[PDB]
Amino acid sequence: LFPPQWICCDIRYLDVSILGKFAVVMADPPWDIYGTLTDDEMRRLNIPVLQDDGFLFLWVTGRAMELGRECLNLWGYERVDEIIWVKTNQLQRIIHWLNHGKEHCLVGVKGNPQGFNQGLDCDVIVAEVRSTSHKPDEIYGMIERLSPGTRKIELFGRPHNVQPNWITLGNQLDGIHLLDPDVVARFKQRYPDGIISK
Amino acid sequence: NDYCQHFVDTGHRPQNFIRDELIRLKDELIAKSNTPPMYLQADIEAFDIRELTPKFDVILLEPPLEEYYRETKCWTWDDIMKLEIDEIAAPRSFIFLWCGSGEGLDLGRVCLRKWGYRRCEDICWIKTNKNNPLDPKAVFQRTKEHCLMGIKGTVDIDLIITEEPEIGNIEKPVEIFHIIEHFCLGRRRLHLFGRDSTIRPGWLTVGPTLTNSNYNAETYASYFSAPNSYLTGCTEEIE
Numbered sequence: 405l406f407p408p409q410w411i412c413c414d415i416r417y418l419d420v421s422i423l424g425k426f427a428v429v430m431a432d433p434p435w436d437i438y439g440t441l442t443d444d445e446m447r448r449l450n451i452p453v454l455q456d457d458g459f460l461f462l463w464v465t466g467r468a469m470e471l472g473r474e475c476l477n478l479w480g481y482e483r484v485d486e487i488i489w490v491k492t493n494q495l496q497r498i499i500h501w502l503n504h505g506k507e508h509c510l511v512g513v514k515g516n517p518q519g520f521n522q523g524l525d526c527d528v529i530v531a532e533v534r535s536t537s538h539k540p541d542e543i544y545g546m547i548e549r550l551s552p553g554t555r556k557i558e559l560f561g562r563p564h565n566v567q568p569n570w571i572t573l574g575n576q577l578d579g580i581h582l583l584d585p586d587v588v589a590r591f592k593q594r595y596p597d598g599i600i601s602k
Numbered sequence: 603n604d605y606c607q608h609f610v611d612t613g614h615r616p617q618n619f620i621r622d623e624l625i626r627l628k629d630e631l632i633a634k635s636n637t638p639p640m641y642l643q644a645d646i647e648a649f650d651i652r653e654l655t656p657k658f659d660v661i662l663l664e665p666p667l668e669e670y671y672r673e674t675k676c677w678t679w680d681d682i683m684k685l686e687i688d689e690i691a692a693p694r695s696f697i698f699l700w701c702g703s704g705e706g707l708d709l710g711r712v713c714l715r716k717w718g719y720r721r722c723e724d725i726c727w728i729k730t731n732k733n734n735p736l737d738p739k740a741v742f743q744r745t746k747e748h749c750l751m752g753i754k755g756t757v758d759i760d761l762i763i764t765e766e767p768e769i770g771n772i773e774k775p776v777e778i779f780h781i782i783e784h785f786c787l788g789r790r791r792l793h794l795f796g797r798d799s800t801i802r803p804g805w806l807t808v809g810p811t812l813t814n815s816n817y818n819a820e821t822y823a824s825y826f827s828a829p830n831s832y833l834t835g836c837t838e839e840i841e
């Protein structure tokens with residue numbers, strides 16, 4: 405069901421098997437480099453159940469450049485691309501050893517994806533920095549052009565992140581908004597009284 | 603505007619639309635303190651890197667990856683990983699490793715860790731195509747290269763933006779030298795796989811295509827004997 409959907413939860417404790425398979429997974433995790441996830445919690449996230457064939461988009465910073473690569477390989481992906489978002493102001497000017505003009509998004513592949521439009525976009529994004537920890541909206545169009553009409557899931561998203569074709573998970577979303585009947589059914593089967601604790 | 607959509611419509615890469623206190627005396631102190639340029643032709647695969655002394659404060663490593671020759675001896679990451687870089691690095695020293703845009707971004711991190719460094723910066727060379735608006739694993743068009751900065755032991759930004767060089771040109775932007783030199787990391791600077799075209803004051807350049815050599819280990823070491831052994835490369839010369 406194409407319109408936006410979301411689930412306020414602790415992604416650690418949600419049983420994501422009820423959600424199905426996705427052509428694309430994107431995550432902007434709270435790495436431990438606020439409300440944080442330890443390296444072991446990040447490693448233990450049940451990313452593998454979410455896809456059979458498709459792409460993972462994994463935002464990284466600092467030493468998560470290395471840790472995110474570990475997670476990505478542990479979860480069964482091969483990093484095949486790395487998107488760079490160059491942060492500008494409203495005038496298209498760029499905002500320890502070096503100042504940081506960019507943020508990195510690792511791109512991983514799992515299985516044998518078929519029918520994606522690889523090569524439409526290039527691997528650099530130039531876009532206004534808005535709210536803090538807020539990634540740019542251009543990534544959704546790049547992802548839509550790469551895999552049009554497929555179902556997608558975002559981890560650690562926030563209200564502004566909800567998009568058509570996307571199911572958003574995060575603990576700062578508002579309640580539970582689900583419309584795909586298969587999801588609704590498996591959710592009610594697994595959570596008949598609508599609580600998620602362990 | 604959405605420059606990603608714009609790139610799919612017109613072919614103009616998003617970076618095409620980036621618009622580019624002195625800090626000059628620093629450059630002058632760097633130039634005063636710079637050793638004369640030194641260079642050696644050496645086939646690095648067959649060459650015992652230990653002959654390169656003394657141990658270096660900065661190593662810039664630019665192995666020629668196959669992916670640099672799309673439309674055209676290349677080094678695999680297998681070959682590079684087997685270089686004994688830790689044998690010539692000073693216990694506190696820095697590395698800058700050009701990794702391309704493919705598997706080098708993973709394998710070059712393995713190299714850094716193998717040689718004893720931790721990555722502290724990821725410098726991106728973003729290439730514009732204002733004058734001209736393909737790995738099978740690739741999901742996106744690759745328009746940049748990465749230079750990893752490693753540290754071992756106890757002003758600028760992490761982006762270089764220039765126009766995409768013409769086909770067959772493998773030169774990296776000379777701006778990487780300015781970034782490295784502005785860190786004031788020490789004066790023993792080695793460039794492995796440099797070329798005649800990259801020789802530069804303050805650097806020892808070593809690579810297989812150099813047509814001339816002037817390197818002498820004793821002469822080179824004399825540039826750093828007391829009282830000049832711990833200069834940053836950004837201080838006044840010692841009288």
Ligand SMILES: CNC(=O)[C@H]1O[C@@H](n2cnc3c(N)ncnc32)[C@H](O)[C@@H]1O
Pocket residue numbers: 413414415416432433434439440441537560561562573574575576
């Ligand atoms: C950089 N973006 C973020 O950090 C977003 O991730 C959220 N978040 C943090 N921990 C968890 C968690 N265990 N389960 C679900 N969501 C979480 C933040 O509250 C924030 O909304």
